[PDB]
Each structure stands twice: as structure tokens, then as C-alpha cells.
Design a protein around this ligand. Structure first.
Ligand SMILES: *[C@@H]1O[C@H](CO)[C@@H](O[C@@H]2O[C@H](CO)[C@@H](O[C@@H]3O[C@H](CO[C@H]4O[C@H](CO[C@H]5O[C@H](CO)[C@@H](O)[C@H](O)[C@@H]5O)[C@@H](O)[C@H](O[C@H]5O[C@H](CO)[C@@H](O)[C@H](O)[C@@H]5O)[C@@H]4O)[C@@H](O)[C@H](O)[C@@H]3O)[C@H](O)[C@H]2NC(C)=O)[C@H](O)[C@H]1NC(C)=O
Ligand SMILES: *[C@@H]1O[C@H](CO)[C@@H](O[C@@H]2O[C@H](CO)[C@@H](O[C@@H]3O[C@H](CO[C@H]4O[C@H](CO[C@H]5O[C@H](CO)[C@@H](O)[C@H](O)[C@@H]5O)[C@@H](O)[C@H](O[C@H]5O[C@H](CO)[C@@H](O)[C@H](O)[C@@H]5O)[C@@H]4O)[C@@H](O)[C@H](O)[C@@H]3O)[C@H](O)[C@H]2NC(C)=O)[C@H](O)[C@H]1NC(C)=O
Ligand SMILES: *[C@@H]1O[C@H](CO)[C@@H](O[C@@H]2O[C@H](CO)[C@@H](O)[C@H](O)[C@H]2NC(C)=O)[C@H](O)[C@H]1NC(C)=O
Ligand SMILES: *[C@@H]1O[C@H](CO)[C@@H](O[C@@H]2O[C@H](CO)[C@@H](O)[C@H](O)[C@H]2NC(C)=O)[C@H](O)[C@H]1NC(C)=O
Ligand SMILES: *[C@@H]1O[C@H](CO)[C@@H](O[C@@H]2O[C@H](CO)[C@@H](O)[C@H](O)[C@H]2NC(C)=O)[C@H](O)[C@H]1NC(C)=O
Ligand SMILES: *[C@@H]1O[C@H](CO)[C@@H](O[C@@H]2O[C@H](CO)[C@@H](O)[C@H](O)[C@H]2NC(C)=O)[C@H](O)[C@H]1NC(C)=O
Ligand SMILES: *[C@@H]1O[C@H](CO)[C@@H](O[C@@H]2O[C@H](CO)[C@@H](O)[C@H](O)[C@H]2NC(C)=O)[C@H](O)[C@H]1NC(C)=O
Ligand SMILES: *[C@@H]1O[C@H](CO)[C@@H](O[C@@H]2O[C@H](CO)[C@@H](O)[C@H](O)[C@H]2NC(C)=O)[C@H](O)[C@H]1NC(C)=O
Ligand SMILES: *[C@@H]1O[C@H](CO)[C@@H](O)[C@H](O)[C@H]1NC(C)=O
Lengths: 149, 424, 149, 424, 149, 424
């Protein structure tokens, strides 16, 4: 329902980002498209994914030094060390997912802000990723300018 | 007119949680993975390691590099001579090459031993030289594990009390004798009526040898092994004995058949046993039966400044010759010893016994500049903190841990939608 | 002053979420209510609190294996191990509190967005949790629709 | 008209900080807490543990389950026989049950010992069997701690040199003698004029016994204890002595009154002492005074493949009988031994001495499938990483740490308001 | 371009926060100032920096207890322990930088919200840190009131 | 008209990343730094430490505080007497102060030893008292390291067999003798024709001394050192020997020239050597040549309840007197011993040898209430987890780690601009 919400759809139906739209006749029925020209989002995702390499390299670069003279594997100690490292890896993961989430969200906000400042101020924000346009001042070629669909 | 960007996910999308934001995606990719493990020998520090070997690491061999299991750069880090072995220098049997092994390195590679195997047919009354070999190398590895350096000590200061005893010689020992131990016999002893006087001696383990500090010496405290009192009594009176004492009179080695049972193999005749011991520096005394006296003449000197677990390389002949696996078994029963072993027979490029393809693959890591861990399972680079299977000890360096692949967490990929709040 | 701010109140006075309101006469005096029908917030809080169980279970499930043959307690080493674990527990806590904070805030944003899209666009956002309504186009029954109070 | 949601907090609200967002709340709840600790014995791995016991874990007892301190499933994991004890099988005193204790398990539970206590009234010239008991079990626990398995070795290969010595018998030992040690006497020795010849023997500790590998043997190196030279001289000439030697002549045990003071209690008469030692496999020699010779005939065989700290269970009679606390004291002075002790007297269901309610509560954990830690304080499940008080060592497994409750951080609850920015 | 974006400037030119402005003539040319009276931002920064002391003190207060009888330094083990501590310090750093970032951003939002509620509703938000004012209803003394420049 | 706050950065701004938000800034400040390290001695727990010393920590000295290297509060924690040393109480040489050192403390400070140095000119046939000193303090430190407490045992129960032997006296020992060892001589022995009887004795190490539990005793097993058999034979018949045995006849000390070489310095005449050993409590036996017998009369009693690495303070005279560095060398070769050493000579305030400014600076930490780590490099407070250079072992407490300053991460400062999203 506009960048603060994510929705579910059954069997088929493509997932992702779409243009959705309002009333009109009183009462209308709405409508969702079949996907934008949001190539900024595609590029932003690629960039954000690649930026995770910094945190992963930090983790991979860290291997404790050890010295064992013993001849038989100490499995339980061995497994404990691994479990602890996986624990640390698990929280880093949680930080990375959140870092992606929050920066993608911001990138979506920056996408919506660009749109607001092209129909300015024909736009009128209704929370992030939503706008009220007067289908009167601005029309068919006008919305096509402002929203690209 | 309300116009919105709308976000939606499929049944194909799954939800990944974060601390401060979640993510929907359809694909995941693992955050990291396992580091490969290469079999064979290697080092984590190319500026602090030492090798000890024979022809197979001897850059001065006439057939080099075809006679060599390592390239030129690695061979330079070895102290090696064709025909040599640590054991051969310990005893110095007649007509054998007598190399003065000496060097320093926290990481140590032992690739010799084969030049004294049953094939060599050394006799000199040895009860069982393969037993002696295994015992000898167990002591070397034990002392090497905690030392920075090693050196042959090719002559101990010794002193005999007997003014009539003379140097011993044997047809079974090329009509001469070992360098170590020295053999003194009293030809006047004859059980007629004549018993002789108890023989005595001292030998000194020095606190240093050349530039090398000695905290520990590996020496052989040899003795004769007789079948029984009756058979010994065709040589001397009383019971056989040879006892080793420290400066105060503490018994530290030997064989005393006045209290201990005879255990010589029936009808084998007299034998010599040469168990190796780790001893502190100092002066040591010997008392023996009048007729036969054995006196240690060499040692291997070690320090206690510390070292890494050592690497021992299988040292066997090609199929045509008679090998043993004493250094293997010595390594196995010694803490901090990593053993490198071929899976296919030894087949040389130069001759039968020098320049083997599998060994050159196994030793090639000696080798690299980017090894971070050396273990009994092989060696690794510092790619990730993880390996698929355990790295068997002994091991040292930046060593990877075993985890199931399933426990490696994943990151979202291929079309991503953020999620926060409850959306309800 | 509207979802970007939290305010203080003395002795009595209930804490929480309220409806507050503007000018009118020039100059007016304002006014704060005594609490909404924000049951969405009550349910959202319950859900967010329960979702912390994931991170807590992760922590509780992680106990290093150990083996001591020694007969007398090594208190100092023992206490050091505990101090380190409590340290790790302390940062997880900090992540969890922030995770609650940021998701509750988002849930409040999603509450405000629902309100904006019922008086649409009679609403006119003035930052999150704030609106300008024309007390003319829309009146008494109208605001009651849009804001439920 | 400006209409707003307004956020406000009371004096009752407190501010909780986060990395990327703070929270106001009125209530807190602790993030986690302590895991309970249950007294008694348990295991962390039900597929790798072994028990050794007597009637109280013997499912074949006529009174089972009333005579048992464990249920059927736990009893099946025990190697037990009514009337048996490790010590009783070590020596084999006349008319006592002689069970061949043998088994494998990384976790080990020892619940026997009571069947040789002062109550049993075994004499056989024992200086102090309670002392012997404590010493014996100290050696068992010491060797068991580092072994995977254990087995009685119910007959060592032995050999005496004397062709005239004969088997010793005593009225004080049911008119016979121990299984171990064997007692050989020379009836012709009489200090008249006749002194006899020094007695000699060998005994062999094997490298294996049935399927069990032996790296270590617990044996008794017994000797006689005399008050003084004068009192010994009514039995033999010279001073008393019995010395034990390894294959080379190193003294490893015995009593030699030629150099060591006599310490026999005044007017007590001759006594036997039987200190236990951990010895390597091999052949061992004995020299003794002509008249009396003692020769070890049994051992307990152990490996060195490793194990967990062991559990030893208090083995005492009910109040009517004479107990000792030797296994308790042995456990206390031995590393890696965890001792389980009752707080109330032993009161049996079957008879006086079998089937005690408190012990069944304490052993019930043997028992469970969800124990993650075993310690001298008791055992725990894997609920949290924390316990209120320390878990006393010895201990092993996933073991909780002690922290003050105040240091456990809290989370906000009951009406929550987010906060970020400076709001000023 | 308004609080969702940060921009680059060459050689000279002061960095920081400025007032920037629109069209007018059709088409205009825009204009950026030379810095506000945003002393709220200066104070907010000082406060946020000082609040990092809590996390730093937590880290400094945590020193593992140890006991070594050995006479020669175990450098490799020593360096490994340090590397692990620096690793932990590195992630705390990353949390602190993000905590500053997110709270400064919020403080900037709270600055913009104050401005919106002084020209109310002459303001009309166009995403955070941006407004559409009718240069007609409100003029020269008016914008000076609303924006302080 | 579109009016905006605009954010911009210079070339002077750099980008700092965060988990959930980045920051532009021009300046950075390091998150933390190194903790200073102070040379000298200190403690981490003021309620559990003990000092042992001489005049320089003796608050009862007539010249206090000018004669003292510690203030009053620290001196109260020391057990000290002017003129005393551990070694002096070990032997009790004639006319020397004989302090009963005793105390308890997990942290231990040893600041004595100088009152027996070559300057003191004690003879009493000592082969080399500086050697004895070094050996003695090596044993003390070794036993102290694992003990909570220490006490002099100023009289062992002893017993001689000889009814004719008499107490030994020497012109070279003030015409009397040590307190320990006691010297018994047989004046009737004369190699004429008369050889005497082998001498014998027992001494007992107790399980406790007053309130102090003894698990370990440091004692001296002395013997005489002769140049050779011929020179010994002007005193007794046969070869020289003095052997120490435990209750069973195990040789644990002594000198036996029947098996061990003579090593007395040529023409030096008879000498005494007194190597210290750590022995268990019990009764011990002695056998010696008829003419001379030495019997230990004192010990130092220790427990095994554990302790921290100890601190040993350089104990030397001012330049005018003859010092040694035996306690330094003892400390260096003993695990868990931290040595505190002056860089400038000892210059006293009271007299030459008491009350030195540098030592008072070094000992001032004994001292503080906020020391968290003590190491061979000095001591630290708990400011940060980091030090610039390594803290040399031995060490204990909350001990800082070495990291390069570059690896300490930084935080942004001086005008800060947040950044999130891709801004593109
Ligand atoms: C002259 O002296 C010679 C040397 O003493 C002697 O030759 C010895 O003869 C004995 C008896 O025939 C042989 O013993 C054979 O030993 C093997 C190997 O034992 C060692 O390795 C095994 C594990 O082997 C498995 O894994 C390896 C790879 O690592 C595989 O190659 C192998 O095929 C197996 O799958 C290990 O279990 C053994 O451990 C025992 O010993 C150690 C301590 O040393 C303990 O820690 C351990 O608990 C256990 O007791 C061992 O390390 C073994 O499997 C056989 O059962 C057998 O014992 C010797 O190998 C052999 N040695 C040499 C050097 O030749 C001659 O017999 C003698 N001549 C005469 C005439 O007297
Ligand atoms: C009566 O007995 C006296 C005591 O036995 C005896 O005096 C001894 O004489 C020998 C031989 O002259 C001297 O040995 C001198 O030792 C020094 C010091 O060795 C110790 O320290 C060094 C490190 O020193 C460096 O660092 C220190 C600071 O820590 C500096 O002050 C110093 O200047 C150096 O830069 C160390 O390397 C040594 O280690 C050896 O020994 C230990 C075990 O004890 C081993 O672990 C180690 O691997 C190595 O073997 C040692 O700890 C040394 O540098 C010289 O080479 C030399 O050995 C003794 O110092 C001296 N001792 C005393 C107490 O006086 C008398 O000679 C004798 N009288 C007669 C007439 O017989
Ligand atoms: C849910 O949505 C995604 C895309 O929104 C669908 O994935 C696409 O499917 C085809 C074939 O499976 C791929 O070649 C495309 O690459 C996918 N899209 C993308 C992200 O590039 C997916 O099939 C949908 N699931 C269903 C069954 O409805
Ligand atoms: C941070 O908080 C959010 C919201 O409470 C957590 O999101 C939940 O995650 C699980 C999957 O782990 C989902 O099944 C729930 O539906 C999510 N709840 C909501 C409201 O979306 C998230 O797990 C927390 N982050 C971490 C790392 O624990
Ligand atoms: C501050 O505010 C809270 C609620 O806003 C007050 O808490 C309520 O008090 C009564 C009785 O104390 C409880 O039964 C309610 O359950 C509480 N409210 C909630 C959250 O359900 C609190 O008393 C106020 N403090 C003061 C003294 O003003
Ligand atoms: C993240 O940053 C915020 C803001 O600097 C910190 O919030 C402060 O927290 C303390 C309590 O710990 C309060 O007394 C201050 O009033 C807070 N400052 C503000 C501006 O609210 C917060 O502590 C930081 N997070 C962590 C875990 O350190
Ligand atoms: C980039 O911007 C900053 C400020 O926006 C400039 O820093 C100022 O420079 C003078 C002298 O260098 C200092 O005295 C001021 O204190 C700085 N400003 C602040 C933040 O107080 C910086 O010089 C600019 N860089 C360039 C070369 O353009
Ligand atoms: C969190 O995500 C952001 C965005 O992907 C990361 O920001 C990047 O940081 C590097 C410097 O480390 C910059 O060179 C890139 O330009 C940044 N990307 C963007 C889009 O700004 C950030 O590093 C991540 N946080 C952590 C701690 O890894
Ligand atoms: C700044 O930080 C310190 C902690 O070092 C704190 O004690 C002080 O009160 C803080 N100052 C303010 C005004 O927040």
C-alpha cells in the first residue's frame, strides 16, 4: 500500500515493485500495474549486495592461531570452537541483512523523493511512495511525466 | 487520485530477519565456505624453518635436480648429504657417510632415515637395529619438538679407568667398530681362574657445541644382552652388568642382570641394545663387568627455547630394496610430530630411489609463501575460518574449524524487498 | 509533538499515545486527549516482544564445552568467562532494544499512513503522526472519521 | 487545524538504549536466567558410558528391583555382581566373590567397594587393608581417568627361580591365601646355621587382554613389614628385603631394609603392605630374602585413548555394619574424579544394605537423555549458559557459568514508546 | 537535494548544511546559501558524540583475567588474542557509527518538523528537509519567519 | 517555490561506514588507547599477599623509616627481621640471625637473600655457597609458586643409629657448626687398621607445622665432596658415600663414589655440597661411610592449595660490599617467578645498604589499590584492554594485550553529516 507495507499474492503474479492506483468514480475499484522502469532499484540492489563483501572479508580474514601437539582429535573442543564462530557469524549476518534492508528502504525513499520533485508540487506526498494528484490540473501526459507510468 | 509504488512478494519469496530491518528475497547465497586442504608438507613462515635430509634433498648430488624431491630454493633450506641419516651419524658405522647435521628453525622437516634400513645390512651385534631406529627417532622428535635448533655432537669427552683394556673390533662390524658407542674389552678376563677388575668410565655432555646451546642431549646408553648367566659365564665371572650413573650415583640407564632377568634370544649369542635417552648436560659415570665396557661417544644436542610441532617425511626405498617404517612409528607415538606418507611406491627419476613424482607433489608446499596452517591432515591457506572435515592434530598456525555447511548462514540475493514494522 | 518527539509529564497524567490538537481562534491554546483506540499498537507491541525470543533462544542455546580435572575451583578464570558472556549478552540486548524501537516506530508510521489514506487527501501530512485538516471542507463527523477522535 | 498523535512518558517510564533506537518502558523483564542443578550422578552421552558395581546395580540379584539403586535400563549399562568389588578381584581373598570387571565407556561410574570394608574381617596379615583400599582406588581412578576401557587381568604369567620354595598358607587367611599376590616360602631357611638362597621371579604385564588394549597396568608391589632386624632375624638371616625391578634393573617398588628403616608396629608381628602402582606393559623382575617371596598375579589393564572425568559413588554399609570412606578419600585426592555422596544413612528396601531411596534419587540421572554437564556440584540441562552458584570441578560437557543476577541484562515490556534523535 | 541526499563540492566551498532554493521565472536557476543558524545541529552533534562514551567504557572495562607461569613470550597466541579483541572492537565501532548516523538523521528530521509547524500549513513537505511554499500567500518576511533565511 | 536544507561534503570529508547508517566527517578520534606500564612490584589483591624480607622491610629497625624501602603500611604486610634471609634460616650458620619466616598470601614478595652473600664470608667447608644459594632459592620459588603459605620448619625429628658418633665442629665454622645439616663424626675410624661401622639415620618431614599444612618440603640433601679415592682414604676406608632413601629404599639424593666419579677440586680438600630438593612428607633414611654422616635438621614447609606467580626482588649490597646474583638466576630459571631489578646501584639513606630511592620507587606499587595486572614488564591499571608493547610473562590478573595503534578503530568528530541509501 505504498513503501511502508509489503503485500502477499497467490500462485502466479509477479513479485516486486509496481504502480498501484486510486478511486475516481465514487466509488472506484483501484488497480495495480505490471512493473515499472525502476532500474535505479536494480542498480541499487546490485551495489548494496556488493558492499556486504566488506563485512564478509573482515570475518574471513580472522582465524585464531593454535598449536596442538596432541595426536588424537579433541572433537568436543573442536566443535565448541566452531559453534562459537558460527554464533559470531550469525549475528554479523543479522547486522548485514538489516544494513541491506535499511539502505534499500532509504534508496526507495530517494526514488520517491525524485518523483515528488518532478511534479512539484503537483505531487503531494501521502507517506513515502504515495501521492495525491489532482486529476484536473494534471492529466494523462502529466502523470506520465511525474510517475513514468 | 492516490498513486503509489506498491511492494509485493510471492510464495517464492522468503523472509530474512535483521537487527533493525528485514528482507524478502527469492534466492540466498552462503556468506562463506570451506578452505581447501592440501596433503603433504609445508611451512607457515618461510624465514624460520630448517630441513634435514639425504640425497633426495641434496642439491650437490651429481644427478640434481633429477635426484631431488624438492626444487632448488627448497633444497637450500635443507641440511643434507647423499647417503646420510640422523641415525647413521649417531653411531657412525664403518664405511657409512657421516654427515654433521646441524641447523636452526622453529618449523622442522625431517626427511631422512632410509639410508639405515634392513637393506644396509649393518650387523655389529645389533639385537635389532630397526628397534633401535624407532627408539632413536622417538627421542630425536621428542627433543626436537621443544627445541629451536639441533646439532650432532660428533665427539664426547670420555675417559676410561682401565689401563689394560683395549679397543673392541668385530668381524661382524667390517673388522672395526662404531664411532659410538666405543667398545673396550679386557682380553685378560677368563673364567681358568681369572675374573679381572670392574670397569669404569666417564662421559661428558657439554652445555654447548659450537654456536649451539645444549639444554638436552639424545644419547644411547648401550649394553650387552646375554641369553643367560651360564652363557655369559663363558665370557666373564658373576652376572653381566653395565650401569649408567649421573654425577651423584643415580642409575639412569643400562642393563643389570644381578637383579634383572636375562632376556637374550636363545642361541642367538651376545647382542647389543642401544636405547636412546634424553639427558641433561653434565658428567656421567659407568660401571660394568670387567670384560666388556660400552661408552657413549656422540649425542644430539638440543635447546629448550621452543619450536613448532615437527614434520617427518616417510623415508623408504623403492620396491626392490628392504625398507622399514620405524620413523613412521616413532612419529606416531610422539607428541607434536606430523607424518607425511606416500600412497604409491617410491619410483625415482635419477635412479630407482631418488626423484619421486608423488613425493615432489607432497613436498611442493615447502614451497609456498601463503600457508597459514600445517596439520596432520595437510596444510591450508587463509581463505576462510572453515574446513569441511577436521584438521587432524598435531597442528599449528591459523587453523580452520569444522562446521556443517548447513550451519553457515546465508544472505539474500536476486531481487530484494525490505520489510519493517508489523505491516498489520 | 507528533511521533518524532516524546514528552515528559509530572506526577499523575497517563503515559502513552494521545490525540493532541491545534489553534483555531488566533491565537488558540491547543489540547491533548486521554488516549486513543490504538489497539493496533497494543497488538504490535505484543508481537514485537514475542519476536525477541528468537535472539534469546540463540543465546541460550550456546554453551561452550569444557573439561576440568582439577579439584579446586579456578574462580578468577571462571568469573572471566562469565564476564565475557555477559559482555556478549549486553551487546545483543542493545541490538534487541534497537530492533524493537525501530520496528515499533515503523509500526507507528504504518498507523499514521492508514489515517492519511482515509482522509485522502483531506489529511495533508506535517511530518509523521501530524496532519493539517481544513476545519471547513471537513468538520466534526469528518475528523471523527479520519482520526477516530 | 494541526492534529497529532502525541507520545509522552511518566516518571514511571525509564529509558533503555539501543544501537539504532531507544525505548521508553515502565517494566523490564530479564533476558535469561539460571539453570537448575541436580545433585547426583548422570551422563552427557547415553551411548558411551559404563558402570562397575555390586548387588546394588545387579539386575540378576534374586531381590531385583528391590535390591537395586537403579532401574532396569540403567542396570544393563553396569557390569556388576552381588558381593563383588574391584579390590576383591584385585587380590582374590579366599571365599570372596571374584568378578571379572571389564568394560568400555568414555563416561565411567564406579559404585562398588563396600564388599571389602573392615566389616568383612579379611586378615591375611594385612597391615591395614583400609590403607591398601584407599591406595588401590587412587590408582584405579588415576588410570581410569585417561582410559576408554578397563579390565581385570585375572592371571599374570609368572615364574619363580626356586625349585624348593612352596606355596604359602596362613591360618589368618582361611588356611589358604590370596589369588594375588602369590606367596612362596622356603621352609629350609633357619637362622641353627642355614640362610638359604636369594629368591627371584619374573611377572609379565601383557600388551593386551582379550579384546582390550593395555597401555597401563595397576598392580600391587607387595612386601613384608617387620618391626626390626632382630624380629626379622627369627625368620631369616641379614635384613628383610623384597625389591621390584624393570627389565633393565631399575628399582620400581618394594621394601629394602638394608638401606631403609624398619617401620613395623611394635609387637604387631609380621605384616603385609600392598601399595598399588601404575606400570607399563613388559616383563618385571623380583629379588627377595631367601625365606619369603611375593609375586603379583593380577592387574587391571587400561588404555590411554582417553576418557572423561570419572564418577565415584559412595559405597558404604547401613549403620549396623562397619564401613570405611577409602573410595571417598581416594576420589578426593585424584584429579578428574567426581564423588557422589549420600546425606542420610543407607537404608535398603530388599535387605538392610540394598535399595536405598536417597541413592535412587541421586543415581536417577543415569538415567536421563538431556544432561549436558556433569560436575562435582551436580548435573544440568542445556537451558541457559548460566548458573546461580559455581559448578565445582571436576566437570565436563556444556557447562554453565556463574554470574550475579544483577549482571543479566533486561528487556522492556508492558507499554513501550520508541525514542530516537535528541528530541531537543 | 534535501536531507535524503548528500552532495559533493570541489576545491573550496564549505561543507555542511545549507539553504537551497527553487524556480520562479520558468525556468529559473536555483541557488544555495552559505549556511544556516542551525545551532541545534551543533548541539545535537556534541551530545551524540558524548553518548558514545557508554559503549567505549563498556569495552574498556572488559579485560580477561589470565595467568602465565611461562618465562618466554608466546607471541603468536598473544597476537591472536589481540586480533580477536580488535575484531570485537571493530564491530562495536560499526554499531556506534550507525547509531550516530541514525540519531543525527532523526535529529535533522526533528529540525525539519519544527520548521513545518511554524509555517503551518504554509510549509507543505516534499520529503524530509524540503518544502513547497506559495510565493504569494507567503512572501519575504514570511519565509524569513518560517525558515530563518 | 521549493526550499530545502541541503547537505554537502568537501574533499576534506571522509566516509565512515556503519551497520545501519554511514557518517561523513572531516576529523577522526581513536576509540581507545594503551594503558601505561609501571616498572617494579605490585599486587592485584591487597587483602591476599605476603612479603618476606630483611632490614629493608623491617619496621622494627632502629633507623625506620630511613632504613626501609617500603612505607609503614606495606612493611606491616612483610615478615622481616634485620640481618635475616631465607637461606640463613635454612642452615642456621653460627652467629647469624635466625628468623622464623612464616606467612600466607596468594601473591608473594621475596625481598631478601643479601644477608648471605660472599661478603658474609661463611665457610664451614662450603664447596660454593653461591651455587648452594642459587639452588636453594630455585627450590623455594618452585614450591612457593604452587603454595598458598610458607613456613620455616626449624627442627626436624631426627635419629642416629651410632652410639659412639659425636657432634661435628670446625674451625672454619666459628668452632661450631650449622643448625642444618647436623654433622656426626666417628673419631675411632682410622685407615692403622680400623674402619668402623656404616652410619645410619632417619629424619621426618611432618605433615604440618603449627597451623601450616605441609604437602611439600624444601630440604638440603648434603654430602661431602672429595677429590679422589686416595684423598678420601686418609679419612675412611672404601669409597666415600652418603645416600638418602625414602621409606621403601628408593634413592632420592646423596653422593655415592662407589659408582659415581669423584669430582672434588684438586687440592681443595674436603668440601660440602648442599643441593635442595622438594620432598613429600614422611620418614626418610640415610646410609653413609662410617666416619662422616650428615642429617637434615630443617626444611621449608609448603602446601599445594595454589598461588600466583611470585615476585622476587633483587637483593644486593651497595657497591662497597661483595654481592651475588643467585636469587636473580634462580628466579630466571624458575617458572612463575617475576624478578624486580634496579638499574642504578644501591645507595641507602640510613646507612650504605638500607633505604634506596630507586628501590622505593620500584616497590611503591605494593602499595596501590588499583593494580589489575602484574607482569615481568611491570604492572598496570584497568584503563583499557591494550598496551603498546607486550607484557612479558610471567604474569597474572586482568592483563592488557598488544595491538598496533593503527589497528585501533576511530570515531567521527567535528561536524558530522549522516548518509544512507545509495543517493544515486
Ligand atoms: C625388531 O624391532 C621392530 C620395531 O620394534 C619390530 O617391528 C615391530 O613389530 C611389531 C610386532 O609385529 C609391529 O607392530 C605392528 O604395529 C602396527 C602399527 O602400530 C602403530 O600404528 C597403529 C595404527 O595403525 C593404523 O593406522 C596406520 C596409519 O597411521 C596404518 O598404517 C595401519 O595400517 C593401521 O590401520 C597404532 O594403533 C599403534 O598404537 C600402539 O602403540 C602405541 C605406542 O607406540 C600406543 O600409543 C597405542 O595405544 C598402541 O598400543 C602403533 O602406533 C599395529 O597395528 C600392529 O598391531 C603391530 O603392533 C611393529 O609395527 C613393528 N615395528 C617396526 C618398526 O618394524 C620387529 O618385530 C623386531 N624384530 C624382531 C624379530 O624381534
Ligand atoms: C659458584 O657457583 C656460582 C653459581 O652457580 C657460579 O657463578 C656462575 O658462573 C657461571 C659461569 O661463569 C655464570 O653463568 C653466567 O650466566 C649468565 C647469565 O645466565 C642466565 O641469564 C641468561 C640471560 O642473560 C641475559 O639477560 C639478563 C637479564 O635477564 C642480563 O642480565 C644478561 O646480561 C644477559 O643479557 C640466560 O641466557 C641463561 O640461560 C641459561 O641457563 C638457563 C637455566 O639456568 C637455561 O634455561 C638457558 O637455556 C641457558 O642455558 C641464564 O639463565 C650467562 O649469560 C653466562 O653465559 C654465564 O653462564 C653464572 O651467572 C654464575 N652464577 C652465579 C649465581 O654467580 C660460580 O662460577 C661458582 N664458583 C666457582 C669458582 O666454581
Ligand atoms: C514470483 O515472482 C518472481 C519475479 O517477481 C518470479 O520469478 C521470475 O520467474 C522467471 C522464471 O521462473 C525467471 O526467469 C525470472 O528471472 C524471475 N524474475 C526475476 C526476479 O527476474 C517467480 O516465478 C514468481 N513466482 C510465482 C510462481 O508466481
Ligand atoms: C527484529 O525484529 C523483527 C520484528 O519483531 C523480527 O522480525 C520477525 O522475524 C521472524 C523471522 O525471524 C518472522 O517470522 C516474523 O514475522 C518477524 N516479525 C515481524 C513483525 O516482521 C526480527 O527477527 C528481529 N531481528 C532479529 C535478528 O532477531
Ligand atoms: C504513568 O503512566 C502509566 C500508564 O500510562 C500508569 O500505569 C497505569 O497504572 C495503573 C495502576 O498503577 C495500572 O493498573 C495500569 O495497568 C497502568 N497502565 C497501563 C500501562 O496499563 C502509571 O501509574 C503512571 N504513573 C503515574 C504515577 O503517573
Ligand atoms: C545510541 O545513541 C543514543 C543517542 O546518542 C544513545 O542514547 C543515550 O542513552 C543514554 C542512556 O544510555 C541516555 O541517558 C541519553 O539521554 C541518550 N541520548 C539520547 C540523545 O537519547 C544510546 O545509548 C546509544 N546506544 C547505545 C547502545 O549505546
Ligand atoms: C571543507 O569544509 C570545511 C567546513 O565546511 C572547511 O573547514 C573549515 O576550515 C577552517 C580552516 O581550515 C577551520 O578553521 C574551520 O573550523 C573549518 N570548519 C569547521 C567545520 O568549523 C574545510 O576547509 C573545507 N575544505 C576545503 C579545502 O574546501
Ligand atoms: C552497510 O551498507 C552500506 C551501503 O551498502 C555500506 O556503505 C558502503 O561503505 C563503503 C565504505 O565502507 C563505501 O565505499 C560505499 O560507498 C558505501 N556504499 C554506500 C551505498 O554508501 C556500509 O559499509 C555497510 N556497513 C558496514 C559496517 O559494512
Ligand atoms: C559525557 O560523557 C561522560 C562519560 O564519560 C558523562 O559522565 C557526562 O555526564 C556526559 N556529559 C553529558 C552532558 O552528557
Amino acid at each position: 500500500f505504498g513503501l511502508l507495507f509489503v503485500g502477499f499474492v497467490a500462485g502466479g503474479v509477479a513479485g516486486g515493485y509496481f504502480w498501484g492506483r486510486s478511486n475516481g468514480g465514487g466509488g472506484g475499484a483501484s488497480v495495480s500495474s505490471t512493473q515499472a522502469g525502476f532500474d535505479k532499484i536494480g542498480k541499487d540492489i546490485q551495489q548494496l549486495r556488493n558492499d556486504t563483501n566488506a563485512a564478509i572479508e573482515g570475518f574471513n580474514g580472522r582465524i585464531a592461531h593454535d598449536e596442538q601437539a596432541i595426536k588424537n582429535l579433541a572433537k568436543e573442543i573442536e566443535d565448541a570452537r566452531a559453534e562459537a564462530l558460527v554464533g559470531e557469524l550469525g549475528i554479523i549476518r543479522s547486522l548485514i541483512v538489516a544494513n541491506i534492508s535499511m539502505n534499500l528502504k532509504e534508496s526507495l525513499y530517494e526514488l520517491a523523493n525524485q518523483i515528488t520533485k518532478r511534479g512539484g508540487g503537483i505531487a503531494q506526498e501521502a507517506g513515502p511512495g504515495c501521492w495525491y494528484v489532482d486529476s484536473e490540473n494534471c492529466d494523462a501526459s502529466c502523470k506520465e511525466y511525474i510517475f513514468n507510468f | 487520485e492516490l498513486i503509489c509504488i506498491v511492494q509485493r512478494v510471492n510464495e517464492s519469496f522468503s523472509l530474512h530477519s535483521g537487527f533493525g530491518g528485514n528482507v524478502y528475497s527469492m534466492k540466498t547465497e552462503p556468506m562463506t565456505g570451506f578452505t581447501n586442504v592440501t596433503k603433504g608438507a609445508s611451512v607457515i613462515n618461510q624465514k624460520d624453518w630448517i630441513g634435514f635430509g639425504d640425497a633426495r634433498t641434496d642439491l650437490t648430488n651429481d644427478q640434481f635436480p633429477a635426484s631431488s624431491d624438492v626444487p632448488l630454493a627448497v633444497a637450500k633450506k635443507f641440511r643434507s648429504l647423499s647417503g646420510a641419516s640422523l641415525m647413521l651419524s649417531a653411531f657412525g658405522p664403518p664405511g657409512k657417510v657421516d654427515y654433521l647435521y646441524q641447523g636452526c628453525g622453529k618449523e622442522k622437516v625431517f626427511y631422512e632415515g632410509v639410508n639405515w634400513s634392513p637393506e644396509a645390512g649393518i650387523d655389529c651385534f645389533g639385537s635389532n637395529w630397526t628397534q633401535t631406529k624407532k627408539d632413536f627417532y622417538s627421542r630425536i622428535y621428542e627433543a626436537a619438538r621443544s627445541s629451536t635448533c639441533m646439532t650432532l655432537v660428533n665427539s664426547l669427552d670420555t675417559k676410561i679407568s682401565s689401563t689394560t683394556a683395549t679397543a673392541g673390533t668385530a668381524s661382524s662390524c667390517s673388522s672395526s667398530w662404531m664411532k659410538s658407542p666405543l667398545w673396550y674389552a679386557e682380553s685378560s678376563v677368563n673364567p681358568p681362574q681369572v675374573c679381572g677388575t670392574e670397569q669404569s668410565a666417564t662421559f661428558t655432555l657439554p652445555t654447548s657445541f659450537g654456536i649451539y646451546k645444549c639444554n638436552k642431549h639424545v644419547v644411547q646408553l648401550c649394553y650387552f644382552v646375554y641369553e643367560n648367566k651360564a652363557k655369559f659365564n663363558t665370557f666373564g665371572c658373576g652376572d653381566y652388568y653395565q650401569n649408567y650413573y649421573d654425577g651423584n650415583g643415580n642409575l639412569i640407564g643400562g642393563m643389570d642382570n644381578r637383579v634383572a632377568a636375562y632376556r637374550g634370544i636363545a642361541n642367538a649369542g651376545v647382542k647389543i641394545e642401544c636405547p636412546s635417552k634424553i639427558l641433561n648436560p653434565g658428567t656421567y659415570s659407568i660401571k660394568s663387568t670387567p670384560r666388556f665396557l660400552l661408552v657413549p661417544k656422540r649425542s644430539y644436542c638440543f635447546d629448550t627455547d621452543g619450536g613448532y610441532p615437527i614434520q617427518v617425511v616417510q623415508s623408504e626405498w623403492s620396491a626392490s630394496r628392504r625398507s622399514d617404517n620405524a620413523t613412521e612409528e616413532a612419529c606416531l607415538q610422539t607428541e607434536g610430530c606430523i607424518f607425511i606418507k606416500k600412497t604409491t611406491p617410491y619410483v625415482g627419476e635419477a635412479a630407482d630411489n631418488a626423484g619421486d613424482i608423488e613425493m615432489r607433489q607432497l613436498l611442493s608446499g615447502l614451497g609456498n609463501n601463503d600457508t597459514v596452517c600445517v596439520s596432520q591432515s595437510g596444510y591450508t591457506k587463509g581463505e576462510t575460518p572453515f574446513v569441511k572435515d577436521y584438521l587432524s592434530p598435531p597442528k599449528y598456525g591459523r587453523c580452520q574449524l569444522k562446521t556443517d555447511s548447513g550451519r553457515i548462514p546465508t544472505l539474500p540475493s536476486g531481487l530484494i524487498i525490505p520489510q519493517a514494522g508489523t505491516d498489520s
